[PDB]
Design a protein around this ligand. Structure first.
Ligand SMILES: CNC(=O)c1ccccc1OC1CCOCC1
Length: 108
């Protein structure tokens, strides 16, 4: 009853991380891999960083969690071409994410 949010968030983040379309998002994009990524994307985010944030008790509300995870998708979509494998992954996983958020009644 106290630590309810933490539990729900952890379950959701784990399901997202195990999803077969999560692989592009598991770790920070490297500048060496992506020319001018960090010029274009000002608030980078990824699921390893979110795991850390969660463990660090940063996600004190649904909204903070939802914003970080939404940003993972919107970074990817802005940066990559629309028919790229990363873009396809991003919308697949975003669909999955919204279905789990609704499924847990996460209200913000
Ligand atoms: C979400 N990822 C990207 O927008 C990305 C863009 C350009 C180059 C690499 C990228 O991320 C890699 C991070 C490590 O796994 C493979 C994708």
């Amino acid at each position: 009853d106290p630590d309810q949010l933490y539990s729900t968030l952890k379950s959701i983040l784990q399901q997202v991380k195990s999803h077969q379309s999560a692989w592009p998002f598991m770790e920070p994009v490297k500048r060496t891999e992506a020319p001018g990524y960090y010029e274009v994307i000002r608030f980078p985010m990824d699921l390893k960083t979110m795991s850390e944030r969660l463990k660090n008790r940063y996600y004190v509300s649904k909204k903070l969690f939802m914003a970080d995870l939404q940003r993972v998708f919107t970074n990817c979509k802005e940066y990559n071409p629309p028919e790229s494998e990363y873009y396809k992954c991003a919308n697949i996983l975003e669909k999955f994410f919204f279905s789990k958020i609704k499924e847990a009644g996460l209200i913000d």
